[PDB]
Design a binder for this molecule. Structure first.
Ligand SMILES: N[C@@H](CCC(=O)NO)C(=O)O
Ligand SMILES: N[C@@H](CCC(=O)NO)C(=O)O
Ligand code: NA
Ligand code: NA
Lengths: 239, 238
């Protein structure tokens, strides 16, 4: 339901939690976040329940790290439970996802043959394992995600990270909104500009089919053929 | 002329440089910045000339540190020169200043008599040595500033840091504008909100006579008798 992600020099957990607070009004059954520090140490915290519960859990875990993604979930596939909450993982691959992967069944079956254990009942978990799978075939996270995305069917928005290389976030808009917020030496992404207003007012709205590679210093957006596309940033007048 | 300051977890040099760029339209002859990392290592860079010259020098010096102050100067006391540019230092005390300290002469002699060496011809440098002096007498940087400000006469604003304790900036508004920018786990200060728009839109204007102690997580504002005052934060997108 709500996605927020950030890639910064400063710790981003508090920014992710504030963004999720801003996305609650939409409604949801659970929420989670994962942050990775510069050494690739990932901390993931999820809760069945409200962001406030997640925030209270985070208070006893000071999550350090400048790369992170967070999500509030309105369950479609798999009952609300902590196991099914996002972020989902596949070793170092961590994903948050809005929407539905229509063809999750056949995909889940392939990945099971490839030796992947599904721990959740979500369609989402297929994204994580599949990117893990593609990445094993060689190349950067961007290249792996360019191969993964066309295999996915449905109306979805996803942000992916590799905890081993916390310097890049990949995001793909494919039926669900995502917008990039531009910072000074940091960048953010959310499913709604409203989440990011406390830290930036300058946005790039991704378009349908866009895949964005986001680092602290650059945003590069591509279509599914790997062609670079140019998207304009705009200043938001909202408060 | 322009002051920008920041206290953050992330490196702030680029934010300071961009704030100075946003203050150039006012005019100036020199500019400088100082940043301190968590271990109290201070890097100070100043240039006679344009902010671009400073930004170019900074690119060969990548300045690390989450606490910093920066300034564009329009010379009033002491000709434009790198020596007279701010920030000025007195060992670990680092200062930027807008305005004029009208009683700088009596204070300079007083601090010379007290053993300080003035390297610059500015009135500004007296602030740095005066705070350093008061701090020697004991107490926190806020307490020292509280004692120092009443000794100064003039229309001025200043932001002060102690590289030994990079977790706090002190600012005093005494006839020249200063505004605090509120961030998330970081805070900023500038002589003009225009400087800070890239990083925040929420501001607290300091009022005349206010002394603010700013950390990454809190802003505490006091008057000269040391009473805590409450100032309202405003959202302001220009
Ligand atoms: N299908 C995924 C995501 C549902 C969601 O939150 N959409 O906004 C799930 O059930 O977890
Ligand atoms: N009097 C100080 C600061 C002058 C000023 O405000 N310039 O804009 C000096 O001469 O350095
Ligand atoms: Na789609
Ligand atoms: Na004054």
């Amino acid at each position: 339901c709500g996605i927020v992600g950030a890639i910064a020099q400063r710790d981003v957990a508090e920014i992710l939690l504030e963004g999720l607070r801003r996305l609650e009004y939409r409604g949801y059954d659970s929420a989670g976040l994962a942050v990775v520090d510069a050494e690739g140490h990932m901390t993931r915290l999820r809760r069945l329940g409200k962001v406030q519960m997640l925030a209270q859990a985070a208070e006893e875990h000071p999550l350090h790290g400048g790369t992170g993604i967070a999500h509030t979930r309105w369950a479609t596939h798999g009952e609300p439970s902590e196991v099914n909450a996002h972020p989902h993982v596949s070793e170092h691959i961590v994903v948050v996802h809005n929407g539905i992967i229509e063809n999750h069944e056949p995909l889940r079956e392939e990945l099971k043959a490839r030796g992947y254990t599904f721990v959740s009942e979500t369609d989402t978990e297929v994204i994580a394992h599949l990117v893990n799978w593609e990445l094993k075939q060689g190349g950067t996270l961007r290249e792996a995600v360019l191969r993964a995305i066309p295999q996915l069917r449905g109306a979805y928005g996803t942000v992916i990270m590799d905890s081993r290389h916390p310097d890049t976030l990949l995001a793909a808009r494919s039926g669900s909104p995502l917008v990039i917020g531009l910072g000074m030496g940091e960048n953010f992404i959310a499913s709604d500009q409203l989440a990011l207003l406390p830290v930036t007012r300058r946005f790039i709205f991704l378009e349908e089919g866009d895949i964005a590679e986001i680092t602290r210093r650059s945003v590069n957006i591509f279509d599914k053929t790997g062609a670079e596309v140019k998207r304009q940033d705009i200043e938001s007048n909202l408060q």
